[PDB]
Design a protein around this nucleic acid. Structure first.
Ligand code: GFH
Ligand code: CL
Ligand code: CL
Ligand code: CL
Ligand code: MG
Ligand code: MG
Ligand code: NA
Ligand code: NA
Ligand code: NA
Length: 326
DNA sequence: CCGAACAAGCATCAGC
DNA sequence: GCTGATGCTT
DNA sequence: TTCGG
């Protein structure tokens, strides 16, 4: 956190542009600059020094100069005073409330936690569960708790069918000492890119985790992606653990490496890697890497036998998960 | 100067 | 119902 | 907002 004041400022600007201005490219620009500055191994002395990094341009350099000189940014001082911006930023902290619904709620006079709680009938299902667990979802998960959760998920999945493989990805797989949620990649040999030989593969796992009261709520659920809520069991007289967000993603078994690369992230790492792929003439998603043809149409999937094969195609040296926390 | 900026699953809605 | 756009999310 | 052609 050599430059934590700068990166906090840029993150706050990113969130303003996403939530309030609905300016996605400014949001991405600020997050990318925060990320590249976060990895920079010197304490930054000037905007000009920062502008040498890719993703930091003229406007962010000027803001860095203001922040170094004064410890603050007038632009943010003013945003913090703006009631509509304050209301919108608060509302978007509820899972399922994005920039559009937040602004609509404000128009309707719904702008505080109390307002939301008395207007549950104006929320869709996702938003209602997001409100229910508003406090819990902003708490971090100690890696010690992530390990207990991993043990439950892996053992319960095994009881449904010993041929499932569940892999915990996200920041956990990158070795983080705490995580914001739990991300689980799931495979089963019945589900490949060529055929689905058994129905309900994801449903059966969700069902088992609900049966043992690990999964407590559902935000969304389809054939390949579950987004929901879980909770560790507590012992006698113990206060309960916070409820936690859990995402489960069933991926074709032959596409595990693209899937685990995607689900390990970070999100900015993936954006950077995919952007580099495009510059190299490839496109990467969670299933495949394919060349781009003469006109920019993706060709056929390329053979992939390891995470490293994907890095090789785009002429990147391999990066272990712990070095992808961008 | 100016076009591109990662890629996609699920929920929800409008239009036919 | 189906299709496609949009919102929200990973 | 930044980058690259
Ligand atoms: N290509 C692409 N991939 C994305 C995106 N968002 C998330 N992902 C992928 C990478 C995450 O690690 C992974 C899990 O998504 P996540 O939001 O749980 O992130 P994470 O890396 O686990 C955070 F550090 P934590 O949850 O601990 O707070 O999903 C995205 O916008 N684009
Ligand atoms: Cl924008
Ligand atoms: Cl500030
Ligand atoms: Cl594909
Ligand atoms: Mg996560
Ligand atoms: Mg570019
Ligand atoms: Na730069
Ligand atoms: Na939100
Ligand atoms: Na997640």
């Amino acid at each position: 956190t050599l430059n934590g004041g700068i990166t906090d400022m840029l993150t706050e600007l990113a969130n303003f542009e996403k939530n309030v201005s609905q300016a996605i490219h400014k949001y991405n620009a600020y997050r990318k600059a925060a990320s590249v500055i976060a990895k920079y191994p010197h304490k930054i002395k000037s905007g000009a020094e920062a502008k040498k990094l890719p993703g930091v341009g003229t406007k962010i350099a000027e803001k860095i100069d203001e922040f170094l000189a004064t410890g603050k940014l007038r632009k943010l001082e003013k945003i913090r005073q703006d009631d509509t911006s304050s209301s919108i930023n608060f509302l978007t902290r509820v899972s399922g409330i994005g920039p559009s619904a937040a602004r609509k709620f404000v128009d309707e006079g719904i702008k505080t936690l109390e307002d939301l709680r008395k207007n549950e009938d104006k929320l869709n299902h996702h938003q209602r569960i997001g409100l229910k667990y508003f406090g819990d979802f902003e708490k971090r998960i100690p890696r010690e708790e992530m390990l207990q959760m991993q043990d439950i998920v892996l053992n319960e999945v095994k009881k449904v069918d010993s041929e499932y493989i569940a892999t915990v990805c996200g920041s956990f797989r990158r070795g983080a000492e705490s995580s914001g949620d739990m991300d689980v990649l799931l495979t089963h040999p019945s589900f490949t890119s060529e055929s689905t030989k058994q129905p309900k593969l994801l449903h059966q796992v969700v069902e088992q985790l609900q049966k043992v009261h690990f999964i407590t709520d559902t935000l969304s659920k389809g054939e390949t992606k579950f987004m929901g809520v879980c909770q560790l069991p507590s012992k006698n007289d113990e206060k309960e653990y916070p409820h936690r967000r859990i995402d489960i993603r069933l991926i074709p078994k032959d596409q595990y490496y693209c899937g685990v690369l995607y689900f390990t992230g970070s999100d900015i790492f993936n954006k950077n890697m995919r952007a580099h792929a495009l510059e190299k003439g490839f496109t990467i998603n969670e299933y495949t890497i394919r060349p781009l043809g003469v006109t920019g149409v993706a060709g056929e999937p390329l053979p992939v036998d390891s995470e490293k094969d994907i890095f090789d195609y785009i002429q990147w040296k391999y990066r272990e998960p712990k070095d992808r926390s961008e």
